[PDB]
UniProtKB/Swiss-Prot annotation:
The lineage of its organism: Bacteria, Pseudomonadati, Pseudomonadota, Gammaproteobacteria, Thiotrichales. GO terms for cellular component: cytosol. Belongs to the phosphoglycerate kinase family. It comes from Francisella tularensis subsp. tularensis (strain SCHU S4 / Schu 4). Keywords: ATP-binding, Cytoplasm, Glycolysis, Kinase, Nucleotide-binding, Transferase. Pathway: Carbohydrate degradation; glycolysis; pyruvate from D-glyceraldehyde 3-phosphate: step 2/5. One of its GO terms (biological process) is glycolytic process. The gene is pgk. HAMAP family: Phosphoglyc_kinase. It is found in: Cytoplasm. This is Phosphoglycerate kinase. Its EC number is 2.7.2.3. It catalyses: (2R)-3-phosphoglycerate + ATP = (2R)-3-phospho-glyceroyl phosphate + ADP.
Amino acid sequence: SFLTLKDVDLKDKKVLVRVDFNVPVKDGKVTSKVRIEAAIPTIQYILDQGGAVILMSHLGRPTEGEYDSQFSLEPVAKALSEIINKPVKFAKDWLDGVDVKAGEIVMCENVRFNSGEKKSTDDLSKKIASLGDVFVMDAFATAHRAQASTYGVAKYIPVACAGILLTNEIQALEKALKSPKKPMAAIVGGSKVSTKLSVLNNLLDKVEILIVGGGIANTFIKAEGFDVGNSLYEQDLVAEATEILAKAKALGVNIPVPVDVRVAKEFSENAQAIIKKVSDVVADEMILDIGPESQKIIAELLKSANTILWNGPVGVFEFDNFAEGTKALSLAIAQSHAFSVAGGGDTIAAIEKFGIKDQVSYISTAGGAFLEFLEGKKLPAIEILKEKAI
């Protein structure tokens, strides 16, 4: 395992916390408070245990060795101060030491400004580590990248553990991917198979039901030999999709390839959907959504599931005439008592549109980290936390 805040000594300790404070900024004011409000339980626990909080985060895309004001975390410090109702000192030159007492909060300048952050150089990692006694990794969105303030600091700090947010995230993802309650259904939607091929390969031997969506499903329809016309699909990944369908068949995994679809003759919000059987798609037409019979099959399957992993829609739900497939998917997940884990920008946009946020067990706000976890890849920041637990 890895250590958590509940099993480390924090009383009269300089505690370095790596948070996700990559918040949007406009006219020297932050425009979102969600990421700041999310870190509050971790900070309050450290403060109540009698420690000193040293906050660390990245903000935007700056160049290492180039301090740029538009990338500074000073508006984030000011926002947190107004939220937690406690003073937050901003340390511009943090690496040269941080003067903090127990019960105080100090916000470091953006890490990505320092040389060696992305590479996780021993020199910078040793310097960050010398600033404190405890390191708390609470930024899951950067766990898939080995950086000095995510990975290196853990190597040299006396004690390294995981914050309340990273704990909850890893607990939820592992409850879906490592130890699920069968049957388990995974939904993998997206534009290309190539982009989610490592995900599909990793889920195939873990899931009972594998639902494919969007451009991914269209390549599977062509793999099943039906003409997809002018739909979005990968002709070069058709042979790979056929192999995935054969592996699934042998494994006893259900891939409910659409039996019916909703086509269009123009890719727009003004286009009208035409319900066709999967075998009746014309050279002119575009599959933009699944059809009503496919909707009911997915609903009935998701009804039986005890674990649901959701990564993508089954259609172009942004267009109301092609939103019925994803709406029915969303409502089936919402009505389910299964432990449901959702992740992906499009997935979250679907949850928001269909208003089922409070009916999804856990919603991941991470992009690349959620996907790399789903690929079965070992995230460097979680791994170093496990090595430090031994």
